[PDB]
Amino acid sequence: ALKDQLIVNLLKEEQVPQNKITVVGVGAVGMACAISILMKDLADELALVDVIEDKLKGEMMDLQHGSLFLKTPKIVSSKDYSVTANSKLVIITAGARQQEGESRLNLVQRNVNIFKFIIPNVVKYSPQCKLLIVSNPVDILTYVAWKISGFPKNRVIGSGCNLDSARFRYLMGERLGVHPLSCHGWVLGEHGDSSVPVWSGVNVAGVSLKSLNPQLGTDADKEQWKDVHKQVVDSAYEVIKLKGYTSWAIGLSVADLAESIMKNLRRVHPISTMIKGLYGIKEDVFLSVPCILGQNGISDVVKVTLTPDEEARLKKSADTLWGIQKELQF
Amino acid sequence: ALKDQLIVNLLKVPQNKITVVGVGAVGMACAISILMKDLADELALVDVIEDKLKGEMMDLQHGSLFLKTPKIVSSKDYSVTANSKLVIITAGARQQEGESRLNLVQRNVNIFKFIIPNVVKYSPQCKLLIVSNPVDILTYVAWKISGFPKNRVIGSGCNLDSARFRYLMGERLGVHPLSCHGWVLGEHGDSSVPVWSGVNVAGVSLKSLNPQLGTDADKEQWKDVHKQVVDSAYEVIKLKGYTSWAIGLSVADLAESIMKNLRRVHPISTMIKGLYGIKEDVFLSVPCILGQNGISDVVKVTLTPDEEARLKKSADTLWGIQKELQF
Amino acid sequence: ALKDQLIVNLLKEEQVPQNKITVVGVGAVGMACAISILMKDLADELALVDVIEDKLKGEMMDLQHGSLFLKTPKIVSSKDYSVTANSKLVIITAGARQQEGESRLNLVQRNVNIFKFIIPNVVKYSPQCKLLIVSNPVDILTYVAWKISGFPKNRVIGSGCNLDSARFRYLMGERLGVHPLSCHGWVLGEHGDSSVPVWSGVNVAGVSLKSLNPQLGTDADKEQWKDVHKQVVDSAYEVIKLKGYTSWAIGLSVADLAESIMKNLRRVHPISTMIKGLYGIKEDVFLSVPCILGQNGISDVVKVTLTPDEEARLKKSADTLWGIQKELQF
Amino acid sequence: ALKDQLIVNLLKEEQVPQNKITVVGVGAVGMACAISILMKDLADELALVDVIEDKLKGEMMDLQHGSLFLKTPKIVSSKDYSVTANSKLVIITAGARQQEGESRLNLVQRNVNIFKFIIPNVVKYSPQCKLLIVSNPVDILTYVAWKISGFPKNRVIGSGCNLDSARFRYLMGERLGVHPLSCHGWVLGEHGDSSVPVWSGVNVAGVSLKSLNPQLGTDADKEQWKDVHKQVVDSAYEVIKLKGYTSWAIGLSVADLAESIMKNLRRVHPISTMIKGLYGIKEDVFLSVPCILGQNGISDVVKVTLTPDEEARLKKSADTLWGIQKELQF
Ligand SMILES: CNc1nc2ccc(NC(C)=O)cc2s1
Ligand SMILES: CNc1nc2ccc(NC(C)=O)cc2s1
Ligand SMILES: CNc1nc2ccc(NC(C)=O)cc2s1
Ligand SMILES: CNc1nc2ccc(NC(C)=O)cc2s1
The missing domain is CATH 3.90.110.10 (Lactate dehydrogenase/glycoside hydrolase, family 4, C-terminal)
Incomplete structure (x- = not known):
């Protein structure tokens, strides 16, 4: 193989990311979080999670294609939360959003139901993570994340x-x-x-x-x-x-x-x-x-x-x- | 005035201005990456859909605390683009599923017939960066319409x-x-x-x-x-x-x-x-x-x-x- | 020339820098100003000026050798202020500095005398610049630089x-x-x-x-x-x-x-x-x-x-x- | 206390850094490595070690006084290597340096001797660090640090x-x-x-x-x-x-x-x-x-x-x- 002709491998891997961030939700908010985090060089690995397979893969690919211009060497995605494993920070942007004339507070029952699935699946794979909640109503959903996760309060943060x-x-x-x-x-x-x-x-x-x-x-x-x-x-x-x-x-x-x-x-x-x-x-x-x-x-x-x-x-x-x-x- | 109680004023143009034409997905991705690389002291946005334009402008302006580009402006009117060092054209019909970028060419040539003379009017010494597709033909067109010397007409290619x-x-x-x-x-x-x-x-x-x-x-x-x-x-x-x-x-x-x-x-x-x-x-x-x-x-x-x-x-x-x- | 085989020149090379900074003095203060400026990508040209021929050349060379890691494509130096042409910002760090047990105010006669030389030469070649005074006593020397320069007071700034x-x-x-x-x-x-x-x-x-x-x-x-x-x-x-x-x-x-x-x-x-x-x-x-x-x-x-x-x-x-x-x- | 009037503390933290870098030696090479790593936001803790107590503390303070302009929240120094604990990367720049006309290879026994002290102290406090050797002659001194440290060869690197x-x-x-x-x-x-x-x-x-x-x-x-x-x-x-x-x-x-x-x-x-x-x-x-x-x-x-x-x-x-x-x- 060309690779082995060119490169002598000297080391059995053990790649365990040290500064990994996950963004949950690849809607406009989540992708804005992603490009901003990529362009500030905050992470050695970025993982994206969502429920629409094609949208998720296309957003992942589009970011990967910009890698030359970035300093985050691993960008990955899956519907399966195991892709988020060993995250230091998990950013939750998934859920319903408010319409014109609708209070963020009207989103609560819909996003609680979603959180009931997301939160247990997030905390499962990242014992060192902080949970940063962005979905709305953000204050109520930070409380919700805290209650569902059973995390101590210092680890559950709302973008507020x-x-x-x-x-x-x-x-x-x-x-x-x-x-x-x-x-x-x-x-x-x-x-x-x-x-x-x-x-x-x-x-x-x-x-x-x-x-x-x-x-x-x-x-x-x-x-x-x-x-x-x-x-x-x-x-x-x-x-x-x-x-x-x-x-x-x-x-x-x-x-x-x-x-x-x-x-x-x-x-x-x-x-x-x-x-x-x-x-x-x-x-x-x-x-x-x-x-x-x-x-x-x-x-x-x-x-x-x-x-x-x-x-x-x-x-x-x-x-x-x-x-x-x-x-x-x- | 509160301002005058607070501040004594002593002194009544941008030097590193960039304009992006087109606030579609390409245009706005250009805008956010430019803002996050501290390349410009003023960013101007131009498009033809008034509400979309102002909303993107405002959404950017709301992040100013976290940026180092102190003036973000927008207008349909190309006077807003005046004194640009660089003008990036992203506007026009965009590539569609299962279709060559070459399928977009006539419509974009038509639109450039409008955009380019307006850019040249307000920034006669800018560099033009063409991103719209098909970028190779549209860079040629921009060059012919602008009358710029070829060094100043560049396609993202x-x-x-x-x-x-x-x-x-x-x-x-x-x-x-x-x-x-x-x-x-x-x-x-x-x-x-x-x-x-x-x-x-x-x-x-x-x-x-x-x-x-x-x-x-x-x-x-x-x-x-x-x-x-x-x-x-x-x-x-x-x-x-x-x-x-x-x-x-x-x-x-x-x-x-x-x-x-x-x-x-x-x-x-x-x-x-x-x-x-x-x-x-x-x-x-x-x-x-x-x-x-x-x-x-x-x-x-x-x-x-x-x-x-x-x-x-x-x-x-x-x-x-x-x-x-x-x- | 290999250059001409490699490269076709399409444009006559009338280079004029757009964001040029000059640092006057390459003592420890001036070189710290230089490296920090270079690492914040603030300038497209950096000029250094001092009176010790060898030290100036060596400092310039050492910076130049870092150019691969920088985004400031031209670094130049000279005793002659023509090197400083077209600066947008000129930073004055030259002159005596305080010994242990000596007031910054005790530097004033020496540094006024040196400013009589430096300030008219900077203004001669950089009519659009702002002057940033760092040399001590900085407050008195900003006043001095202002008087000498014939600049309006807005453009003569002390690091203070x-x-x-x-x-x-x-x-x-x-x-x-x-x-x-x-x-x-x-x-x-x-x-x-x-x-x-x-x-x-x-x-x-x-x-x-x-x-x-x-x-x-x-x-x-x-x-x-x-x-x-x-x-x-x-x-x-x-x-x-x-x-x-x-x-x-x-x-x-x-x-x-x-x-x-x-x-x-x-x-x-x-x-x-x-x-x-x-x-x-x-x-x-x-x-x-x-x-x-x-x-x-x-x-x-x-x-x-x-x-x-x-x-x-x-x-x-x-x-x-x-x-x-x-x-x-x- | 004013701190307690102002702030309510939620928890006694794990104050163990995630991205700690240590620079051994605060001569010109060591301090230029330090300022550069600070300005590239690579670390959450910078430790400095040298043997001259006064110069060490002066350089730590000078760096510390610029903190407002940095994103490295803890800068510390000590002649004691306990200060280097939990470093991801330890950069060794200490030892005799080329005089004018002098071959880097002429530094070799002086610097091997200094390394017989330095390396076991470093390894004691960061047994999992990477070592980056800058001291000269750098190739031979990388061999020396590898031999003395007992690290696998992947974790002992010379600036080369x-x-x-x-x-x-x-x-x-x-x-x-x-x-x-x-x-x-x-x-x-x-x-x-x-x-x-x-x-x-x-x-x-x-x-x-x-x-x-x-x-x-x-x-x-x-x-x-x-x-x-x-x-x-x-x-x-x-x-x-x-x-x-x-x-x-x-x-x-x-x-x-x-x-x-x-x-x-x-x-x-x-x-x-x-x-x-x-x-x-x-x-x-x-x-x-x-x-x-x-x-x-x-x-x-x-x-x-x-x-x-x-x-x-x-x-x-x-x-x-x-x-x-x-x-x-x-
Ligand atoms: C378990 N249910 C859901 N998970 C997710 C994860 C991500 C998103 N994405 C958005 C944009 O809301 C929506 C849902 S709905
Ligand atoms: C006909 N003139 C036009 N100017 C512009 C300027 C910007 C845009 N926007 C996009 C994204 O196509 C479309 C047009 S159509
Ligand atoms: C008399 N004119 C002078 N110009 C300069 C310019 C730079 C320096 N250098 C320092 C570090 O003081 C000293 C002098 S003395
Ligand atoms: C006793 N061993 C030594 N440790 C160190 C640590 C740092 C330095 N620093 C320099 C400037 O060479 C010199 C020595 S000699």
Whole structure:
């Protein structure tokens, strides 16, 4: 054989991937996660799982054909979860998505049913994985993943408000003429209608914008900064209305979270976690708060100081989400 | 104003602007890969479907926190493309299941009659990167319509075909594609030419280890690797309905050589009149040095009698189509 | 020629670089700036200039030999400033540097005299450039480079406290178990002994550490956070005491500023610019305050809200700098 | 405590890194390897070891102070090898270095002695690491580390001719007006004076320069391409004369090798390995041939077809190294 003429093999294999990531679902969100992760060099192996064989194989092939331009030497796919074995991070994007005028919360019974199959099959083959949930309603489905998997809370993460805050910071940037990296501000709570802009923390160079205008984000605000939060809440729906779905931004947001996990960075992200014990919340609610993210998932939670109004808005989001949790049928 | 309370302003054009024409799957794959390789300080998108266009723009803009391209704009109106260093054309009818890219030619020539003069109007000194199919004929057309000197009119050509060939060779050999070397030239399509004479790892000619390499007499039928290269788009189209990611990555690799003036060699579409035994204004892929002025030099690959035959055949097939077309 | 057999030239070769950077000085600082810039792919041409013929050629050669691993296709050097033609960014690292036990301010007479030569030669060949001053005392020398150059003040930028703030954020993250990217805090004023830690802006996820612990950074602070700023002031002197000089941190700091300039990012950095008009300051003092940095340099200045003590401290830094700058002749 | 007021901790972590790299030796070569590996985001922990305590701690601090600009969250140093525990890759750059005019082979007994201390300490704390030898003479010192470590030969790699081949490709590029990435050519054998340029493999776009010019690299060569290989052999001496040492190109070369290993790329590099059984070599000689390099080190060797003259040169290189190697006191 030509190969053996050209190459002397010196070593019996033992290929056990060291930085493997799995993306479950090859819809537009999942493939946006994939290309973003590939282009950030975060993994030595990428596996894709879905239920439509042809679509899955074609997406796998299309990525493989770009390998020259990449640094991820093994891209694989199967309907069978054994392909995901030894993943450090498994990203769940499968399930029904919201239509125009439909709340993400309306997706819950359909995606719970799907999760009942996906989660046990995922955790089966990857004892070291973190589970990053992207499917919606993301906060409820992170709770669901946690309950079905039996994983400890640090290992079950929801993409949560990482995108909402990125959007908030983009829109703020545009108003001030400053790059979003230098515009700081947190949208917490539900990834959806009841999210909470934390005006008290919104700043450039440590300068509190609320300190300069204490009516920031209220109806009295002459510059109507609340509209920036409204734009954040409406963003997914506006993009859905224009191009049919969203993909690129969530892909990049998920890639940003993957980077923190895979590279043990311990950056702070507003992502879905259990918050029993904070802000007077006494039940097992999952919602976005600022969490320190690394190789063991969420190891630490930042206790954001909230005004009485912000705290009320967060408890409100927490009641909403708990109310849907009480509808869950395991 | 809050802004004025916060910031003292002291000072009232982009220098590395890229435009992508067409926000179909190819176009948007180009856009995401360009954004993720930090090649541009402004990205403009142009298409004719207003809602689709604005939505893709917005979806990109929402990821800005995670990118280093501070201005992302879109419009149907080509004034948005002004001052582009590079303009990438991906628009037009796209390859369909079970059909040659050559089936798309007249309709795309018609559309280029509109797009190209509008691009030239707002960026008279850009480099044009044609991706639309059939890319070899459309690169020629772009050149004729624009009036640009030929160095500034480049087709994505066989960059991707060669990438696919090096992936497949790497999979056979257990080696990364970066370390597997080999060229697919000619048409970006069914008449492409694998230059077996050049295929090598670490400077070791595979033909030296297997003289029949790529012929019918090759006991390990490496010709099938080229067959896989030719069929690849057809199979991917059959499976997922179009191709996007590999071509976006390929186009971004080329944008990088242009924007960074790398002078790397790529098998990309250029006018081959008076080279490799060819007499008409045919564009096809040969290895070209690519940089800030586009294509400045061509590598004269030493072709076997056959490889030269296949290459002249690929040229004939294309000039066959190009001949009998109206513009 | 083999070249002509191999290659047909189709185009006359009128090369003019589009993203050229020059580094003046190939001491440890300049070469650290060089390698960091080269590894962030910010330039299509790198020019080096110094006065020691052999050292310059050797440094250039060593970089050139790495070209396969880089994406900067032309690296050149010369004593003659014609080598620097057409630069978009020129970085000045040349001049005397402080010994152990010597103030950066003690370098000023030597480095003013050298700037009288360097600055007109840079401007002669790079009429479109921004000037990034790194040579010390950086605040006074930015003022000097501005005066000599005839450039507008937006295009004459001092590396300032970009490094001091990076040190502060590193030390803070170390204490808190958080990546520096998520620890926010500004050190302003002189890049030197009179710098000001802005405790009122120090935060994680928008949470003010001073609201948590009002004594933050005072002598009554039970965790002695003032020790963090003292480590920042002393950093250069400690590293100089240990390895003889500093290089890697300042190289990375300068590369960070080069990125914002070359990619027109409009990030906010604490860098040296004129502050006449703010904080009661009447004279042409240059010091660090947070500025928006982009392709035309510093286009905007953020007005940080300072406590009375912080502001008094910033005004004293200005006074210190004016004390030396008022005596300069050039 | 302020940390606890700010942050709630969820779990006591496994603080064991997944992608740890250690650099032994913090002279110019070691620190250029360090800055390059930092800027390529290859590791989640960088450990430095050397024997001079002050210089060691100064270099650690200087790197540490740039953390904000990096994605390597822990940088540590110690003269104690406990600091290196759980390294995936340990890069040995320590020992005496070429003075001006000095042959790398002249360093051999000094560096074998240093290695009798270094290697067992490294192996104690990372029994599963790959070893990357950079110290000179690198071929013989790779043999020494292999013998002392007791590792299987796949896990003991010498940086070899990776740099010599990068230099060759740089020079060919500047001759042809092509980027080094698109110029191909292999320099094999000893990293030093007896290296062998393989003229038969020298190509652009698969076009053999020898096919164009049948006298390429020979005494008859109109254009004296052999000068190009002479320049490769002479490069380190020239740079040492000019700047006193070499650092940047070797830093970049070592980082490129680290990348292949750490990301399991399975690229081919001309690096130091045992070539017993090739080219009629009957003894445990280490020298550079093209090797497939990945997460288990050197898994495969490409068999280059050499002319009789090229093979004779290569066996000459083999004999030279074996003369010294075969009599080592250890
Ligand atoms: C077990 N049921 C399902 N598994 C999966 C896995 C992936 C996907 N994909 C999408 C895009 O929703 C859908 C389903 S439905
Ligand atoms: C007739 N003019 C046209 N311009 C454009 C510009 C972009 C596109 N988009 C695609 C993907 O075909 C289609 C057209 S048709
Ligand atoms: C008097 N002019 C001078 N120009 C330069 C340019 C560079 C340097 N080098 C350093 C490292 O200070 C020193 C001088 S002195
Ligand atoms: C006692 N053995 C030694 N270990 C080491 C470790 C590092 C270095 N460093 C250099 C610069 O040679 C030298 C030695 S000598």
